[PDB]
């Protein structure tokens, strides 16, 4: 059996190549200035925030903190959760999307490449607790690996100064894909700040410079769903301070 919605999701999954980084920056240009973007930082899981925003949102995308070598990352982690409660993994393994993992496997570097996976209308089937929803809710998803900072530190430390130059260059492509497919509502988060070991305050600043810069106004509403189980909330806190300008 195939679960409803999946067939059309796999058909519509498209790949964005490194050479299309130019056309993705033009897409930001055409969307810049469209809304008076309002912004918020919540302690939600990516899918919880998505469902919350679903009703009011015209076009709703979520960012998957993906692995660069395995669909679902080989399985705590956000991509592992997206795959338990939705249709993601059937879209990430679609034949058309395989160059993303193929090239990244040859890559030789823990910075990875600038392939992205857009998956339209990914049904969320289950809530955080693992219970089925009375009906599935669709959410478009953008898949991009943040550079593995921890793998870099162990293998090519001469590459550490390019970690942030990659995170920026790549977060601009994510927002590029999102403007490209004319999304109104984004759920972002602490991309690369767990298993991949980048600093949260660094990632959060990156996004900020983008949303007051090349992507200022490209989106109606951007939610940072940072799930942070620790009592003193380090990852979450960094996103609140570094984004307190934009949520006011
Ligand atoms: N369901 C969730 N929803 C929202 N935020 C979450 C969630 N889970 C964790 N966070 C927060 O997001 C932060 C980072 O989540 P991480 O999963 O490490 O993504 P990465 O980009 O660092 O690593 C990607 C690789 O790790 C995976 O294995 C992939 O398969 C790849 O192999 C966490 O600290 C949480 O605060």
From TrEMBL:
The keyword Chloroplast does not apply. Coiled coil: none annotated. It comes from the Bacteria. Keywords: Plasmid. The keyword Transcription regulation does not apply. Disulfide bonds join 39-247. It holds the Pfam family PARG_cat_microb. Gene3D superfamilies: Leucine Aminopeptidase, subunit E, domain 1 (3.40.220.10). Residues 1-127 form the Microbial-type PARG catalytic domain. This is Microbial-type PARG catalytic domain-containing protein. It comes from Deinococcus radiodurans (strain ATCC 13939 / DSM 20539 / JCM 16871 / CCUG 27074 / LMG 4051 / NBRC 15346 / NCIMB 9279 / VKM B-1422 / R1). The lineage of its organism: Bacteria, Thermotogati, Deinococcota, Deinococci, Deinococcales.
């Amino acid at each position: 059996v195939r679960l409803p919605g999946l067939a059309a999701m796999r058909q519509g999954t498209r790949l964005f190549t490194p050479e299309q980084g130019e056309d993705l920056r033009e897409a930001l240009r055409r969307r810049r200035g469209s809304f008076q973007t309002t912004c918020e930082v919540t302690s939600e899981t990516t899918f919880a925030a998505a469902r919350r925003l679903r009703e009011k949102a015209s076009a709703l995308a979520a960012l998957n903190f993906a692995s660069a070598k395995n669909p679902g990352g080989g399985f705590q982690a956000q991509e592992e959760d997206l795959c338990r409660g939705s249709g993601l993994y059937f879209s990430l393994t679609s034949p058309q999307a395989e160059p993303y993992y193929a090239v990244n496997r040859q890559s030789h570097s823990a910075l990875y490449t600038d392939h992205l996976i857009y998956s339209p209308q990914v049904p969320i089937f289950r809530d955080d607790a693992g219970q089925l929803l009375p009906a599935p809710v669709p959410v478009n998803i953008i898949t991009a690996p943040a550079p593995n900072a921890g793998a870099v530190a162990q293998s090519r430390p001469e590459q550490l100064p390019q970690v942030l130059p990659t995170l920026r260059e790549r977060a601009r492509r994510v927002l590029g894909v999102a403007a490209w497919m004319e999304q109104t509502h984004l759920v972002l988060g602490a991309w690369g700040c767990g298993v991949f070991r980048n600093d949260p305050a660094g990632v959060a600043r990156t996004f900020r410079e983008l949303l007051e810069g090349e992507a200022q106004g490209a989106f109606e509403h951007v939610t940072f769903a940072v799930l942070d189980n620790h009592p003193q909330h380090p990852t979450l806190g960094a996103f609140r301070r570094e984004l307190e300008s934009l949520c006011l």
